[PDB]
Amino acid sequence: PIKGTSGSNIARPRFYNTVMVETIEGANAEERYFNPGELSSMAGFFNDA
Amino acid sequence: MQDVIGKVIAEYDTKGKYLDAAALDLLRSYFDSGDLRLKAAQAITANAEVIVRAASAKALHYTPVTKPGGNMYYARRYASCIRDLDYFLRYATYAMLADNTTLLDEYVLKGLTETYRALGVPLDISVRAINALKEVVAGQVGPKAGQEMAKYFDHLAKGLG
Amino acid sequence: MQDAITSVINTYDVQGKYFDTSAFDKLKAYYATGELRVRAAGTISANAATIIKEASAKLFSNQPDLVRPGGNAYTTRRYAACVRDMDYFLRYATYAMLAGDTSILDERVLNGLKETYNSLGVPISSTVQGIQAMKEVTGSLVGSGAAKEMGVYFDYLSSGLS
Amino acid sequence: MQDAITSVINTYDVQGKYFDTSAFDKLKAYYATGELRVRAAGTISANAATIIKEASAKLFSNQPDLVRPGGNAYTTRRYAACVRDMDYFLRYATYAMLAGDTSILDERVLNGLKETYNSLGVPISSTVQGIQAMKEVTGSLVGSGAAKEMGVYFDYLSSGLS
Amino acid sequence: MQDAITSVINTYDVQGKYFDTSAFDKLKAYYATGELRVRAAGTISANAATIIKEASAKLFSNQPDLVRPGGNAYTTRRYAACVRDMDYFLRYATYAMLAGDTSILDERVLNGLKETYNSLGVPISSTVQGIQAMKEVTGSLVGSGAAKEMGVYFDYLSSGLS
Amino acid sequence: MQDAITSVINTYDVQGKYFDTSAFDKLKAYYATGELRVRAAGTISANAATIIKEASAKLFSNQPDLVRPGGNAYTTRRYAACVRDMDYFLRYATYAMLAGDTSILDERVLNGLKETYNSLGVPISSTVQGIQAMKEVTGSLVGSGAAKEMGVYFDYLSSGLS
Amino acid sequence: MQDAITSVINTYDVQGKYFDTSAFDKLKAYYATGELRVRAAGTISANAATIIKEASAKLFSNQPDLVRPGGNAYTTRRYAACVRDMDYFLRYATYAMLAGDTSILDERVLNGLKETYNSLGVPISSTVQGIQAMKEVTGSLVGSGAAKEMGVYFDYLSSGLS
Amino acid sequence: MQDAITSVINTYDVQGKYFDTSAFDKLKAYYATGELRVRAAGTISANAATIIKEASAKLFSNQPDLVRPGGNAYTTRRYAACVRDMDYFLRYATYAMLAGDTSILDERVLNGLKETYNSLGVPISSTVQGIQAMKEVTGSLVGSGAAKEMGVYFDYLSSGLS
Amino acid sequence: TRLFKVTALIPSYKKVRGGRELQNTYFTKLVEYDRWFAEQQRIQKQGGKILSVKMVA
Amino acid sequence: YVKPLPNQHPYGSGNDPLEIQFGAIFKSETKAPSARPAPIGKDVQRILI
Amino acid sequence: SVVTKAIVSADAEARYLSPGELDRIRGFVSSGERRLRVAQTLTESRERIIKQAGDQLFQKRPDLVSPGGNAYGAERTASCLRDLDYYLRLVTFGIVAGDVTPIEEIGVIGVKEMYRNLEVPLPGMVEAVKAMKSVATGLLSGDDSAEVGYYFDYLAGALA
Amino acid sequence: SVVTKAIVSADAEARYLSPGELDRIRGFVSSGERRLRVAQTLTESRERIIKQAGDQLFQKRPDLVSPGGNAYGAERTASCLRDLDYYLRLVTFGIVAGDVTPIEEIGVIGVKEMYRNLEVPLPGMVEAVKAMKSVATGLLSGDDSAEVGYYFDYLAGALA
Ligand SMILES: CCC1=C(C)/C(=C/C2=NC(=C\c3[nH]c(/C=C4\NC(=O)[C@H](C)[C@H]4CC)c(C)c3CCC(=O)O)/C(CCC(=O)O)=C2C)NC1=O
Ligand SMILES: CCC1=C(C)/C(=C/C2=NC(=C\c3[nH]c(/C=C4\NC(=O)[C@H](C)[C@H]4CC)c(C)c3CCC(=O)O)/C(CCC(=O)O)=C2C)NC1=O
Ligand SMILES: CCC1=C(C)/C(=C/C2=NC(=C\c3[nH]c(/C=C4\NC(=O)[C@H](C)[C@H]4CC)c(C)c3CCC(=O)O)/C(CCC(=O)O)=C2C)NC1=O
Ligand SMILES: CCC1=C(C)/C(=C/C2=NC(=C\c3[nH]c(/C=C4\NC(=O)[C@H](C)[C@H]4CC)c(C)c3CCC(=O)O)/C(CCC(=O)O)=C2C)NC1=O
Ligand SMILES: CCC1=C(C)/C(=C/C2=NC(=C\c3[nH]c(/C=C4\NC(=O)[C@H](C)[C@H]4CC)c(C)c3CCC(=O)O)/C(CCC(=O)O)=C2C)NC1=O
Ligand SMILES: CCC1=C(C)/C(=C/C2=NC(=C\c3[nH]c(/C=C4\NC(=O)[C@H](C)[C@H]4CC)c(C)c3CCC(=O)O)/C(CCC(=O)O)=C2C)NC1=O
Ligand SMILES: CCC1=C(C)/C(=C/C2=NC(=C\c3[nH]c(/C=C4\NC(=O)[C@H](C)[C@H]4CC)c(C)c3CCC(=O)O)/C(CCC(=O)O)=C2C)NC1=O
Ligand SMILES: CCC1=C(C)/C(=C/C2=NC(=C\c3[nH]c(/C=C4\NC(=O)[C@H](C)[C@H]4CC)c(C)c3CCC(=O)O)/C(CCC(=O)O)=C2C)NC1=O
Ligand SMILES: CCC1=C(C)/C(=C/C2=NC(=C\c3[nH]c(/C=C4\NC(=O)[C@H](C)[C@H]4CC)c(C)c3CCC(=O)O)/C(CCC(=O)O)=C2C)NC1=O
């Protein structure tokens, strides 16, 4: 038996990466908003979608 | 490290003048070749391990370097050699997409030569492996893109040599 | 995190079946708003500082006691922390709008927000009012069509606090 | 507890002011939403046992481990405890919805639930899944307008556990 | 972590006692089984891949839902994580058998494992089934006495998870 | 509170499996040792007062400062509570021996005991010495095998306290 | 970290001698000057921003090439480094003035400074001209008595640069 | 950092050949000297404090000026640094004697030490004299057979510093 | 005895690294006096070779 | 992990009121976390003074 | 440039450019002709745009030309014209580059201290850049004005 | 070796060799003669071990020397047998050293990605080294066979 517990969170593993997910986490990793390149890339993604 | 755009912007900022017709023409030359560079980037990205493997087979496998007493004689040293070839291929692709050789100097040639002296790495065999990698890359990407890759590869070779 | 596409893919992958009509309808709806949402995200990215300025002005005009002695925003440090929190809320609302999902808000904002604001003594109702003020300012800045999309995620944040 | 009208009353009491236009606007908003709240509350009271039934069935179908041997819900005792917890969640979410404030959820439900579950060994992820199941089950019964109102309180419970 | 020698040393250290006849009896008993333990550990090190493969085959045959969509083995990534956990359990059972004490099993494996699996969504019962499959595989390769000894630690792991 | 039989029942219930040969082997082992357990328990029950008297005498002889003024066992009420605690330890060791499991010791004896003594100011090391005093006193009355059996539970109490 | 008082201690340590009358005389001189030293420090720290203001203004009036493109000061970043170098020179001159010794200039400023400016394309002559234009304003502000001591450090900075 | 065993392994691996009879004889020599090497290392570990005591005393006896003011060891800091240098040198000499090869001296002792002393100005003659003082004494404690073995390593350190 | 300028090359023997790790292996750094003994010990235990050290101040 | 169960309420330490004359003072999970969960079983009996 | 950011991010994770980054460079190079056309258009408008930005700034912030203002005086106008010219050139460099890094490096990193040295109010900067943006977007097409708006609003936000 | 690992461990804590470490080194140097016997017996019969090691490897896995296989061709099969010779020599080095650190430093660290560049199947390597273990343990007595086979099982696990 366990003498102690630390608790359980809600884990969020990554299955695969999407273009939108990659761009948004790229912005969030640097803790910033979007530069024109990322904006144009997202526009092109929504065009090709 | 800088692109062609970065270089021309730096030059015209040093001069202090707006981008004239000549600078715009060089920028158009860079953007027109963009699709070719991106296609070659696709090809290198998809088949990078195949290219490195072919280069190692043609340049390194049955030379005495892989024999005992040779610089590649170890599982660790052989793996490190293949890892270095991966470095060269990836950063050559970076230089092609940048259309500039500054990133090769700053990222790859900064302290590499005397590091190879200290570790005992042979320069000439490394240059031979880079040349073989250049041949394999040209064969995979066709003549037009191979011509561009050749500049970055022999830049690496001159940096080693 | 997730986005709308990842949520749809996982919904149809856990079942083991191809995209049905509802899947294509959801994907079409998400893709249709994509250019409007990208335009809104660009406008907010270029103009975050303004939105924070008028939103904070409206909040502190509606509740002066916050910026007077004894208020949680009475100090240069606490005022700066307040406007910094406003910038967090704006940026994460933009991220969620672009993602089409609220997973990033649960994962990276709401997880630990109540504990933080209760430990620091920050008024949660006044924070909800500030988020609402950013909602009106952003809606005025990016247009009504993008205003609704951004207000969805602002309302998500507001209901997460209260 | 505290609801929206008492919330306005309390903030104006702490500030020591008579009601202004903003307070009357908030009160009018609550009065506008109250009839919809009453309809949704009556609907949920009618279909409480049903909603619990489909939500629990959906959760145990998505996560069959819980009910199978070695699962946290595997016993008559533990299964009944799960259903009791879900009934509590539904009733207090209905109270919060009809009140228009989530304070009752903080006090009666959320203040102590994480530590209780962590000591008991309950999977909090599966419990959030059960709350989401209740949310999407009750949305179809109360109607879209009432579903939007009930969703914020189900999201509040889910975020409090997470 | 501690072995049998360290366990006896601690149980006589807390009492402030020198080793008596019973302590030397226990130490002699442990030293008697040392060669058997080393042989079993070497054999299991030699055959770890075989044991993991055949035990995983047995588990996924008796639990087909794990590898089907919605199961917690349904991808190559998720399957690979499962077989890595299987390698964990076999390695730590070998460590515990070589030490002669279950302290490493409680310290480095069992503590916090249920909470981690609850967070991830891993089914604990199927993990116990995989561990029992490990026991069945390992007994044949290690022989009778070594099978009894190693089955003690597999049972300890199973009861810790169960 | 679970004995050996209940432990096997639980390890087979959590797996959902019916009983097989191994479970019958474990229960047969318990049934084999049951006669020794019952005889030892009866002997300790008949001689409980004598064991407590002997062990308290030995402890207060080895540590006379306890019953002298300024010692934690100096008053009639504190001496009574000390021998009452020794009665707890003996009785619950008898229960654990008869059940064949140490669950009742984690379950009814050692849970929060350190905090209770630390709040009361009770000496922990002296209590462990008294538990030993009971162990050596009880072993002589119960014989070699029953002493080997009861020693694991007395050492369990000592290690849990220490 | 060299100081005149600390320099005396270091000298008497390395030669292994006691206090002598000359050491007391020079310590008395340092302590007597210390009050005007602090007054000069306070006056400069009052006006160090302004001193930099006119020093940079005079430098860019006399040598205007630096500001327009093709000068080393044509960039917001390079302008920042330009004014920061002058601020560093003034601040470290004041630190030496309070310290009463020039060794801090050799340790923290001059060593490698020639090589750094020549490697980075920094013009030595314009830097020395700026140091002179800052010399004049500092000396005018502090007064002749303080200026005599303050200007020596500036001369030594220039000489090291020249 | 290689012993004699690894030294012959490398000298045979670099040429790609298997071990020869001469290699086996050279291995036999080290395997024979291993017991006396271990005994010498044990005595050295026993008396390391004493050899440090006497080595410092003798070094500061034959050269007086170091401890006195103006000396290379004139400080408690520099005194501790010097005695620490002796301690590290002696420990590494013991390491090399156990390994039977001088590679460890190159790879952890002479690696950057020589130019470190050159930049620091440490007198090489005094260090070498300290090394003779250390080895002439350690030889007596370790015995002549181990003395001649320690001699080559101490002389190697001296020649490296020289 | 304040600062040391140390040029050192630390190779890799435990594995092969996929990242750049070129400046991590060969580098020149300024190290304080009180830290230099520990830093030299760390470099020597890592297997690296100290190419040079000089006195700056 | 290495010690028996604490003297604690089965539903956490934040479920223990302060033993004062009046007031019902409990710890809060949000104002300052200060939370210790423990694997107290269904049959565990607390030790009371 | 966009390619520079993509290469830096690719090196950061030590792998070849992702399909998302590769598509970003695709869209960047495919839009090169339009961006160069916009930058060239910004050039023919030299004195026009500079003066409408200037007098709009004067109207919006009379304090700058009022007595006691930092820009008060005829000589200050000569510096005003070339400062607005510098910022316009940086905007064009960013337009061709596709990212604001030339703007950040040449005119934003250290501008804060620079105008603190000159005792220049940052609000004057934001109002001047807003005037420039208004004039430039008015001259340029809506689709292209939207793309130039990011650069001008970045200039305004970074200046304050 | 055992001495080298003990010295490294002691140096990690900046201390002398522990009584346990002195004891382990004493046990290593005591039994070094038997390790020399084992290494000599393995070395003397190297060509046999290699030849029939290739024999069971190729009969157990005909696909390797089948067309399309990694070992097809006289040169490639010769390199196969030379790799087996390398690993037998490494095993003898490990026997002499008393531990597996020669195997680590020569032929284990980076073996997977090296044989990835070589297309070499690692199950084939495992089967080859298992055949080598069977043969070598067959030539040696059981007391030797156990410790000799431990090194081969180590190598097989490394390749697997
Ligand atoms: C104790 C630390 C502290 C400070 C310092 C502080 C300053 C402060 N000044 C404010 C407004 C203001 N402050 C000023 C003063 C400016 N007018 C001129 O430009 C001058 C350059 C300058 C004064 C010399 C003005 C004019 C306003 C009104 C602007 C508005 O309506 O937002 C406000 C907004 C709320 C209010 O007006 O009460 C704050 C919070 N708050 C704090 O908690
Ligand atoms: C993206 C996830 C995230 C969030 C949400 C977040 C909020 C957050 N706000 C904080 C401080 C603060 N936050 C505020 C917020 C203001 N108080 C006023 O009353 C307003 C009602 C309100 C905003 C409109 C204040 C005043 C402080 C200072 C509190 C203090 O230092 O005592 C802190 C403490 C650390 C610090 O002081 O910088 C955090 C963690 N941080 C994060 O990383
Ligand atoms: C070990 C103790 C234990 C028991 C007994 C237990 C009962 C149990 N009965 C269930 C459903 C069920 N049980 C029954 C049985 C009924 N069919 C007829 O009506 C009869 C009156 C009656 C049986 C004689 C049926 C039909 C269902 C399916 C109900 C549904 O799918 O909604 C389920 C849900 C299974 C799932 O969600 O996957 C459980 C857990 N659980 C436990 O942990
Ligand atoms: C899309 C990404 C993806 C795929 C395809 C995938 C396949 C996959 N097939 C499996 C079983 C299996 N797969 C196959 C064979 C099939 N395999 C196919 O590639 C052939 C067309 C075909 C035979 C010609 C067989 C026979 C098994 C049974 C178990 C075993 O092979 O040992 C398993 C192991 C789990 C289990 O035993 O059920 C995986 C992970 N996993 C993934 O994450
Ligand atoms: C510890 C004390 C200290 C000193 C002494 C010091 C001098 C110094 N000035 C530097 C750069 C610089 N220094 C200047 C200033 C010069 N160029 C201008 O035209 C003027 C003629 C002149 C100033 C009056 C400039 C413009 C740079 C930037 C060079 C570059 O772009 O790298 C640098 C390199 C840092 C950098 O490039 O950002 C140093 C170390 N720094 C220090 O921390
Ligand atoms: C493990 C291998 C190794 C050693 C032992 C080593 C010693 C060493 N001694 C040092 C200083 C010193 N070293 C000494 C000792 C010298 N001066 C005299 O006493 C003697 C002639 C001589 C003794 C051999 C002294 C006295 C100092 C401090 C004096 C000073 O500041 O220059 C330093 C400079 C950094 C510091 O002290 O923290 C090192 C690294 N370095 C290494 O990599
Ligand atoms: C991205 C820029 C970059 C480069 C260029 C680079 C090269 C590089 N190769 C290294 C090792 C090595 N590199 C090689 C490969 C060489 N020997 C073979 O014969 C060939 C002729 C030749 C390659 C074609 C070998 C064998 C080693 C192992 C050295 C040793 O362990 O002694 C090392 C030492 C660090 C380590 O082992 O991980 C570096 C820094 N590293 C970088 O971060
Ligand atoms: C016999 C030992 C004992 C004491 C003394 C005690 C104090 C106590 N005072 C309380 C309320 C209170 N106590 C005060 C009094 C304070 N606030 C004012 O500002 C004054 C500065 C100050 C009094 C001089 C107030 C205002 C409250 C109401 C706060 C609330 O209930 O929310 C409460 C909350 C429960 C209740 O109101 O019934 C307690 C427990 N509890 C005990 O078991
Ligand atoms: C390409 C990057 C770059 C920029 C942007 C730059 C601006 C700059 N403007 C300066 C002067 C100045 N610039 C201004 C103009 C501004 N101040 C007022 O507040 C107005 C609101 C505003 C006009 C719109 C003023 C007032 C001065 C001080 C005296 C003068 O007019 O020259 C100076 C000091 C040297 C000089 O007189 O030329 C610099 C470095 N330099 C650069 O290398």
Ligand SMILES: CCC1=C(C)/C(=C/C2=NC(=C\c3[nH]c(/C=C4\NC(=O)[C@H](C)[C@H]4CC)c(C)c3CCC(=O)O)/C(CCC(=O)O)=C2C)NC1=O
């Ligand atoms: C001592 C450390 C060390 C090892 C282990 C090592 C292995 C090694 N084997 C090689 C060739 C090879 N090795 C093999 C053998 C493998 N393929 C077969 O399928 C079998 C499964 C298996 C042998 C049992 C083959 C077929 C080749 C030819 C591959 C080629 O030329 O492309 C090569 C390429 C260079 C050369 O042949 O000279 C290396 C580096 N090198 C080293 O320095």
